Each structure stands twice: as structure tokens, then as C-alpha cells.
Amino acid sequence: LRVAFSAARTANFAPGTLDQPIAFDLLHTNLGDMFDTGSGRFTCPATGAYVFIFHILKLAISVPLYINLMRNEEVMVSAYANDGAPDHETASNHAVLQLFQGDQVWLRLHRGAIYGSSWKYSTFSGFLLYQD
Amino acid sequence: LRVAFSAARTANFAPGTLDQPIAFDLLHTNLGDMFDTGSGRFTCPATGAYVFIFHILKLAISVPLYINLMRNEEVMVSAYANDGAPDHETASNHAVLQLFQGDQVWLRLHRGAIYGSSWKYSTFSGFLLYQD
Amino acid sequence: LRVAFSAARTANFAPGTLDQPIAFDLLHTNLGDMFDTGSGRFTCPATGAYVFIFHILKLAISVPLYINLMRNEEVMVSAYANDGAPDHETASNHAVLQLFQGDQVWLRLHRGAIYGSSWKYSTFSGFLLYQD
Ligand SMILES: [Ca+2]
């Protein structure tokens, strides 16, 4: 199988409620058709090891940015960014995860707000490394 | 094909004109010989999906750092970093891109200035994920 | 061979001596059994090209964070993070390295202190790209 996605958000996300999934409207690639832009979820099509990377730019507001990489309902890794000016700042992390078919991987906006524009600062990608 | 590069800049880049390509003088790997240090460009040797990652440390000056990952003449993803002290800060992003043979991928210094030293803070890498 | 690890630190690291290796207590994956949590070292099981990524969150103290990605006793790439508030900040980088069997890759805390918690902000991963 060839499975890879690379997504970006081109409009801000500032929902007004904590702990929301982050949709990504734009895709550069979606090999395998397993990323869903509206929900922001990647669905595992085949048990195996997958690599994920994300970079999220915060709005220049005095609220810190907290991002979680979720697998189903579990926090796998997290990222923090804040600047007191307040200026933009970037919350980023990565993971290599063992997934089972049907598992979903997604980013949660725990706190803060996300910058989106056509220059695609805020991104989320993943790819299949080893298929079972 | 085996295609992968991992480059670093070991001297500062502060050109004095906006929107300049970023050369990377040092290579840890250049499997496939497709990265050119002088131009900072990766040339696609075979249509396929490629992964790119970059981390760029800014000079501690009161000019923000804006980096674009370019494919040919198009902005694919971007990164921002700034600190008001001013301190060093890091502009980073990644992408998984569908490339065609002959396409070129490179980093553009939109604004700001880059820190280079022998400890290799400022880096740019890529590798072939799926060959067509 | 299938070789990949993805580690996180869930407790702080503030050793009180500069230039210390960083242990990572938690693993999401350790395909090939080549990451050692206590030493923080990945041992190369087979000559080839390997990808490494790390994201390290600093303690909110007025000491900057400097991280080196080491191969044996050599600095390969480095990362810096600091914020004057002082706030948390993230030191991150990546590399694609040609390794020989027996080589060890690890992260060095040059200066600063690392934040660890159950939300897994501070991470280190690697995987085999091309086996010789
Ligand atoms: Ca930062």
C-alpha cells in the first residue's frame, strides 16, 4: 500500500471551546484517500507503523497554544507554544506509531488559536512506514 | 532508487535583499546526488512522493524570520519565527509532496537572517518515499 | 529489517552538570529493539541511512536550552530554544544520517533543562530508511 497525506490549514481556527479537533482544508497529497479534511482525521487502512509530523502556528494573542496528537481518544505526544509580546509561535512534534486498521489519528486544539493563511504555516502529515 | 539528502548551513545568511534562495554548504548525505549546495535546490530524479523537513535558526536581530518551502516557483508550506528580546528562534516545517522528474524543491528566505555555525542548527533534508 | 523507535520523556531532566546524555523513559515503538531507554542511545543494527527527529521542551527558567544530536562522539545537528519571560520553548531538529552497524545516535543536553510530563512534549524518534 501507498499511504501518505500532507495537509495545511488556510484559515484561522479559534473555536471558543477547549479541546476541539483541528480540521485541515488543504491537501498536497492524500495517497490512499485516508485523510478526511472536515474532521481532520487520518484513518489507518492497514495495520502497521506510521510516521506523523505537525507544525502549528498560533495566533498572536495572549493565550498559549497546546496541541495534542491523538490516536483514537488517547494523547500520544503534545506540543506547546507561547510568546508574551504576544507574537506568533509554533507548536510542533512528531511520532512513530503502531496503528491497527481503523485507528484514527488527529490533532486536538487543547487551548489557544491557530493561524491559517494561503502560505500554509500550519500543517499535519503522515505516512506508512511499515505495513504488517 | 535511493534518494535522500541532509544539509546544513555553517555560516550566516543575511543577504540584504528579500526573497532569496538559501544555499546549504554542508551535507551529511546526498544519496542520488540530487541536492546542489550552491543553489540550495533538490532536483527530482524520478516522479514520486518525497518528504521534506527543515529547521532554520534566525539571527538574534529585530527582524522576523520567514521561510518558504518552494516547489519550482510555488510556495508549498511556510514557517515563521521571531522573538522580541531579540533572541534566536527557529522556523520549521515539513511536507510530503508529489513531484515530477525535473521539479526543484528549495528554501526561500522571504525575510530575516539565518544563523550558521559548525554546530549545524539550520538544516534542510528530503527523501524519496514512493517512486512512481 | 524493520527498525524504528519513538521515545518520550515523562519526567524533567535537570542534571546540574553540562553535556549529559538524555534518557527517554517511555516508548511508543521500538521495532528492532535498538533504542535503550536508560542511556537514551539508539544502536545501529545494520549499515544504512536512518532518519532522526526530536522535539525538546525546556523548563521555564532563565537558562537557554541547547540540544545536540550525536553520532558516537560527534555533533551532527543542534537545536536552541530560549524565551526571556521565561516561558517554555521547544528545541527541535532532524537529520538523515549514513550509519554503520554499531554506531550510536543519541541526544545531548548541552545546557538547560528539559520538561517531562505524561503529555509527552519532549520526544526523540528514528527509523531505517535504506538498508545497505
Ligand atoms: Ca519557538
What topology does this entry show?
The structure is a homotrimer of 132-residue chains.
Chain A: E1 4-9, E2 20-21, E3 26-31, E4 35-36, E5 41-43, E6 48-57, E7 65-71, E8 74-81, E9 90-99, E10 104-111, E11 122-131
Antiparallel strand pairs in A: 1-3, 1-11, 2-10, 4-5, 5-10, 6-9, 6-11, 7-8, 7-10
The structure holds calcium ion.
PDB class: signaling protein
Keywords: C1q domain, Wnt signaling, signaling protein
Assembly: trimeric
Descriptive report:
The structure is a homotrimer of 132-residue chains. Chain A is mainly β and 132 residues long. Chain A has one domain: Sandwich (Jelly Rolls), CATH 2.60.120.40. In chain A, 0% of the residues lie in helices and 55% in strands. Chain A is built from no helices and eleven strands. Chain A has strands at 4-9, 20-21, 26-31, 35-36, 41-43, 48-57, 65-71, 74-81, 90-99, 104-111, 122-131. Chain A is globular and about 50 Å long. Chains in contact: A-B, A-C, B-C. Chain A binds chain B through residues 2, 4-6, 8, 28-29, 31, 53, 55, 57, 83, 85, 87-88, 90, 92, 119-121, 123, 125, 127, and chain B through 49, 51, 53, 68, 75-84, 90-98, 129-130. Bound molecules: calcium ion. Calcium ion is lined by residues 89-90 of chain A. Residues 89-90 of chain A line the site of calcium ion (CA). Chains A, B, C: Ca(2+) 1 binds at residue 83. Chains A, B, C: It is found in: Cytoplasm; Cell membrane.
